[PDB]
């Protein structure tokens, strides 16, 4: 084909043209490659030019003689050529035209021929040429879209174009900086996340940014444009490594800033948890329309709902900054602040409660060790308004009989129930504050914090009481007092918040596990918000951890306290990790593994790979033992990001149980406790293997930890999983008891387990998305790793909640009707077809009033187009409240 016998032009061809395409096209193979590359001699390029018209004509005859045998021998080598490698880039006038038919040859091989090899060879040639050619290339794609003969090729035509660009060979800085990408987006949405994700560049996100911002109004409408971008980002994040991940989030934040629909913008600001970024977006959500309508409601509900706080007050990092701005614009003082503060959320909780039904009071017995268990169940089940009101009011019965750290805990747990009330409920908390021993007085402050997270308007503030008490001596008094301060002050960026965090007013006067709470307390102030980069919290961790080599339990808590504070950016976490490394401790290797794992999430690449890494045949301390058996679940990602990833990692996970279990006998005991937590922390779509596994082993071997970890899963949906668990927990409970202490655990789990069908359900969503940063999961993870029989643990134990709203109220526009639109769900599943980002919108219809039953009927697609209202919120991982822009005054409610 490089022959001067004519296959190429050493002189003008016309004879081989007709003849060669039937059997297998020989003419165009040598012509496009060999002639162009050997001679870039311009007199010879003119013969080719004259030849060019002929070249166009070749495509219709070539489509006539299609058949797999005729097509396969003809071209393998055109596919391979690169323009810059024939150096035909360096003459622009005549080679550019030669590219116009050259493309038309390639497209037939790419899709129609189905095997994996033809696509990959074909990618390298399209990309290089496309970027260099640009503007003319856009015209070239259109000509192909139409097709010389209208046959099978057209359907494929859109995908191949964008599929080719993915490769991004040679130039990576492009030639256009808007790319050829733009017309393809509207036609095909599937191909595009494949391109951004493999490319894994910030530059990739730049090209995507420019085109979506213009395309918003012009192409079709705002609503579809908004939808296209949200899907694209979602594939892309998993593939990018963590330092770079922060950069892509901001880039995306700009596309959204302009847009009418805010939902995705908030998720990006949440991931980072930055003070400045969240402020910028909020002011932008409200501004579009000065009337309250979708704009203000969308911004206010969506950003505030998002989690980072175990208490129900959600973020509150945004709350102080955002509120002053919203009252200034003035749509009313009372409306802006009421939605903004937790007050509106207190009502919606109350109404949902009835439908879902209640597991009764958490009381069992007020005598013996059972009185401690009773106390603990009330706190765990309800961090909201109860129906167990009657037991709490009567303080004297439950609260007082309590022993040791359980007294402090009883007093905490009471605040959880009183949360959503403070218009009379406050008074008792204050009686408890004045009187008696330190444990009860400190308990009352922790509890106050909890109640005073039900308002931001504040009445007889908790904040005043606390300040003086932390300072005040007695290790039990300070311990409760600091922990309370973390809720009450909140995620806020007020100077009041910043200044307190600087001195460690917490426990550092004991060499026991109770001292560990000090690092936790500084974490409790931030509550998921990003670091100020304070030195005090990092230094404290070295001190406490170093001195013992005697408590396994102590060493692990200091990195766990740090993780809470650290939670925020990929950028920020590298810096705080540095300070610790300078000194080296074998106890730190436990912390090194924790911080790295928290930092890494947001990436399927770095995270899963770290998550199997084991040496455990040296020590069972913290020394070389490390976090590894615990770590094996792969929870951090599942919580953080993506709907697909959550099931895939669990798929890995099942096999890992065997590996620990068989590997050691000791390994099995520890593995069983942490595996049961994956279910709660991760929110998998699998409920097959693990619930049953735990149940059967616990009949064989008394071991109390198993019931406890399981019941935390059992809160999520309470007669899916709870069906099995309730039976097992009861049977063991009443055929085995080893101690009063042993009994106490088994009851606590047994009661915690039921609380019918998705009431104050646990999900690690935001309920606007689940791609964002969830609540502090590490607090149940802390209670699950170590024995729950340890009396010291009790204070921390009371908050291990990781709840997600029972709200499924429709809003995001001002109309404010209860019980939202019709939607699609499949709840006869354990894996599903669509988990791209948004699932199938057919399935089997659900619009019932009762709260959604996920995590084996997880899929919700929001459907509303038939009713003629449109979603502002498309399913981004949401499991709570709908956001729509309503053109109706009353939002329909359906059965299904």
């Amino acid at each position: 084909m490089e022959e001067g016998g004519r296959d190429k032009t050493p002189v003008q061809s016309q004879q081989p043209s007709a003849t060669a395409p039937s059997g297998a096209d020989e003419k165009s193979s040598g012509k496009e490659r060999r002639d162009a590359g050997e001679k870039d001699k311009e007199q010879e390029l003119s013969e080719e030019d004259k030849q060019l018209q002929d070249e166009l004509e070749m495509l219709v005859e070539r489509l006539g003689e299609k058949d797999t045998s005729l097509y396969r021998p003809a071209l393998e080598e055109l596919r391979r050529q690169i323009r810059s490698s024939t150096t035909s880039m360096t003459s622009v006038p005549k080679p550019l035209k030669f590219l116009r038919p050259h493309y038309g040859k390639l497209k037939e091989i790419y899709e129609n021929m189905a095997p994996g090899e033809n696509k990959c060879f074909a990618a390298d040639i399209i990309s290089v040429l496309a970027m260099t050619m640009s503007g003319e290339r856009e015209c070239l794609k259109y000509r192909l879209v139409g097709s010389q003969e209208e046959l099978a090729s057209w359907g494929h035509e859109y995908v191949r174009h964008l599929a080719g660009e993915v490769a991004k060979e040679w130039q990576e800085l492009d030639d256009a900086e808007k790319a050829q990408r733009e017309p393809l987006l509207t036609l095909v949405k599937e191909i595009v996340p494949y391109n951004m994700a493999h490319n894994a560049e910030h530059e990739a996100c730049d090209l995507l940014m420019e085109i979506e911002q213009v395309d918003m109004l012009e192409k079709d409408i705002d609503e579809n444009a908004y939808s296209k971008v949200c899907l694209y980002l979602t594939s892309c994040v998993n593939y990018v490594p963590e330092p770079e991940n922060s950069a892509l989030l901001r880039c995306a934040l700009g596309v959204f800033r302009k847009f009418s629909r805010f939902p995705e913008a908030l998720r990006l600001a949440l991931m980072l948890n930055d003070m400045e970024l969240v402020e910028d977006i909020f002011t932008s959500c409200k501004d579009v329309v000065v009337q309250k309508q979708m704009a203000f409601m969308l911004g206010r509900h969506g950003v505030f709902l998002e989690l980072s706080e175990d208490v129900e007050e959600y973020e509150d990092l945004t709350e102080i900054m955002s509120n002053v701005q919203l009252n200034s614009n003035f749509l009313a003082l009372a409306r802006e602040l009421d939605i903004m503060e937790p007050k509106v959320p207190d009502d919606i909780y109350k109404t949902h409660l009835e439908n879902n039904r209640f597991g009764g009071s958490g009381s069992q017995v007020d005598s013996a060790r059972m009185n401690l268990a009773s106390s603990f169940v009330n706190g765990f089940v309800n961090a909201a308004f109860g129906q167990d009101k009657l037991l709490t009011d009567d303080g004297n019965k439950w609260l007082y009989k309590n022993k040791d750290h359980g007294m402090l805990s009883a007093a905490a747990s009471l605040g959880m129930i009183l949360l959503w009330d403070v218009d009379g409920g406050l008074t008792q908390i204050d009686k408890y504050l004045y009187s008696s021993e330190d444990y009860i007085k400190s308990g009352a402050l922790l509890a106050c914090g909890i109640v005073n997270s039900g308002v931001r308007n504040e009445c007889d503030p908790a904040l005043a009481l606390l300040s003086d008490y932390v300072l005040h001596n007695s290790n039990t008094m300070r311990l409760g007092s600091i922990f309370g301060l973390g809720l009450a002050y909140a995620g806020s960026n007020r100077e009041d918040v910043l200044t307190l965090l600087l001195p460690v007013m917490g426990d550092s006067k004991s060499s026991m596990e109770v001292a560990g709470v000090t690092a936790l307390a500084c974490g409790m102030i931030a509550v998921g918000s990003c670091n100020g980069d304070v030195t005090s919290t990092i230094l404290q961790t070295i001190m406490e951890k170093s001195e013992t080599e005697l408590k396994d339990t102590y060493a692990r808590w200091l990195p766990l306290g740090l993780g809470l504070n650290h939670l925020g950016k990929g950028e920020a976490i590298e810096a705080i990790l540095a300070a610790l490394e300078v000194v080296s401790e074998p106890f730190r290797s436990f912390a090194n593994t924790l911080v790295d794992v928290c930092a890494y999430a947001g990436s399927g690449n770095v995270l899963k790979v770290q998550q199997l890494l084991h040496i455990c045949s040296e020590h069972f301390d913290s020394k070389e033992k490390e976090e590894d058996k615990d770590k094996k679940e792969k929870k951090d990602k599942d919580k953080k990001e993506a709907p697909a990833d959550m099931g895939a990692h669990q798929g890995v996970a099942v096999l890992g149980i065997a590996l620990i279990a068989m590997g050691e006998e000791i390994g099995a005991e520890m593995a069983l406790r942490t595996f049961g937590h994956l279910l709660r922390y991760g929110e998998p779509t699998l409920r097959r293997a693990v619930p049953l596994a735990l149940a059967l082993i616990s009949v064989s071997n008394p071991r109390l930890n198993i019931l406890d970890t399981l019941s935390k899963f059992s809160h999520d949906a309470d007669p899916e999983v709870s069906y099995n668990s309730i039976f097992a927990m009861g049977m063991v409970g009443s055929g085995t008891n080893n101690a009063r202490l042993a009994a106490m655990l088994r009851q606590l789990a047994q009661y915690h387990a039921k609380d019918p069908n998705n009431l104050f359900m646990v999900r690690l969503a935001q309920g606007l998305t689940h791609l964002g940063k969830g609540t502090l999961t590490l607090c149940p993870y802390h209670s699950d790793r170590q024995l729950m029989s340890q009396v010291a643990v009790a204070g921390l134990l009371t908050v291990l909640v990781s709840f997600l709203d029972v709200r499924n109220i429709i809003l995001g526009k001002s109309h404010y009707v209860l019980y939202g639109l019709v939607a699609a769900m499949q709840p006869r599943m354990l894996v599903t077809f669509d988990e791209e980002l948004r699932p199938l919108p057919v399935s089997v219809r659900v619009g019932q009033a009762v709260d959604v039953v996920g995590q084996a009927g997880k899929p919700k697609t929001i459907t509303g187009f038939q009713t003629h209202t449109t979603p502002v919120l498309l399913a981004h991982g949401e499991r709570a409240e709908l956001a729509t822009e309503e053109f109706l005054p009353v939002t329909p409610i359906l059965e299904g």
Binding site: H202, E244, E574, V595, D596, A599, V609, L613, S617
Partner: protein, 146 residues
Amino acid sequence: PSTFAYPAPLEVPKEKEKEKVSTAVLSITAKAKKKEKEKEKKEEEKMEVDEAEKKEEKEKKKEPEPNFQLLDNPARVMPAQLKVLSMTETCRYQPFKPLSIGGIIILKDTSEDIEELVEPVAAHGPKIEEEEQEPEPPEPFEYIDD
């Protein structure tokens, strides 16, 4: 002086059985941990990643064992003089070693020679004496011993 030397203390059989068990634990755990860990994205503009947090991917170690090539005779002839301590030798002598020495005579003390080379393991008479006899310090083991 270094081609016939005092070979190392032995590997021994005893240590050989004992070591394998030790080597076994370190060996699986290092390889299992080191190979699996990546912290790299290869379809990225970056080569690996600018380093976020420290890696565990790590590398292996190699230690050989020292041996010099196939010979049963001296390596290097040598025209330099080397001091020999009597019956501790320069390092050590083997039967080929005195062939290579042209010397086996002394002019390095008061003593001198009346006789030249004597071939390998054979007696030479050093002349410290007038021509008869005189005593000399005790190198032989029995005098030192008692």
